[PDB]
Design a protein around this ligand. Structure first.
Ligand SMILES: O=C(O)c1ccc2[nH]ccc2c1
Length: 284
């Protein structure tokens, strides 16, 4: 396997840091002027993580159309993802407005509400069937329908109601609950099992709007999820699966959102996930 001998060549040489900095050096730089307007300061979790103007998701309202979210459009793979930050106390209603407007079927959450003793995102979904949430600023109602709690992830069925039209939709919440507070998982087996559960749901498929993916900033763990998916899809589709270059896929994705893959360890974990997942592209 091409990728695995590169991995072994990089691992034996211990050059992960050097490969990673080469990506950072060649990555696209595009303007983010809307994200930096003074009226949007409380709509951004981190001062150094902004959506590019060319690829940002626009909210369908005349007041202020801004959300910290980007459309990643992978032309050859025929997949689209929205990557966004963990919602803030004043952006929970914007978040559900985006899910409604973009016709998403799935939300993928790769972080816990509290990590390292600090809050990484708002409690943006209801925890009990009989205690629904109402977002008065965007005129939406959200109800917990069911909850399936497993060892590495939880799947929730949610009902989102547009209170303006009384239309309802079923949204699936895929919550990966065991990514460690520091570093990356030791094995990618549970991450790959999670990705195939999202795929089987239909959430990644062209008959729906793009899946919404988030962690705290929406670039690290979120980056890893969409890079592994797109690389495995390209191996399925091409005559020479051995032509799939993970560094080139990552630079293509970084034309649409800055900073995807935050550390040299997340880059190595991404290689490991694609290598292991590839076994199934190898008819097993
Ligand atoms: O690198 C390779 O040799 C190779 C061959 C077949 C494959 N199918 C999916 C990945 C892959 C790599």
């Amino acid at each position: 396997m091409e990728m695995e001998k590169e991995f072994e060549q990089i691992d034996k040489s211990g050059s992960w840091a050097a490969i990673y900095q080469d990506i950072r050096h060649e990555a696209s730089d595009f303007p983010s002027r809307v994200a930096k307007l003074p009226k949007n300061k409380n709509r951004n979790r981190y001062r150094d993580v902004s959506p590019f103007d060319h690829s940002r998701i626009k909210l369908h309202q005349e007041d202020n159309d801004y959300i910290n979210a980007s459309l990643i459009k992978m032309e050859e793979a025929q997949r689209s993802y929205i990557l966004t930050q963990g919602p803030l106390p004043n952006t929970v209603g914007h978040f559900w407005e985006m899910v409604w407007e973009q016709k998403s079927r799935g939300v993928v959450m790769l972080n816990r509400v509290m990590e390292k003793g600090s809050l990484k995102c708002a409690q943006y979904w209801p925890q009990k069937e009989e205690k629904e949430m109402i977002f008065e600023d965007t005129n939406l109602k959200l109800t917990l329908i069911s909850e399936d709690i497993k060892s590495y992830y939880t799947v929730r069925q949610l009902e989102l109601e547009n209170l303006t039209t009384q239309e309802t939709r079923e949204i699936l919440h895929f919550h990966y609950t065991t990514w460690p507070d520091f570093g990356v998982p030791e094995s990618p087996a549970s991450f790959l099992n999670f990705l195939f559960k999202v795929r089987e749901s239909g959430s990644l498929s062209p008959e729906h709007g793009p899946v919404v993916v988030h962690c705290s900033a929406g670039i690290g763990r979120s980056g890893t999820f969409c890079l592994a998916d797109t690389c495995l899809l390209l191996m399925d589709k091409r005559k020479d699966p051995s032509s799939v270059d993970i560094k080139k896929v990552l630079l293509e994705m970084r034309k649409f959102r800055m900073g995807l893959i935050q550390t040299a360890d997340q880059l190595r974990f991404s290689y490991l996930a694609v290598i292991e997942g590839a076994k199934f592209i190898m008819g097993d």
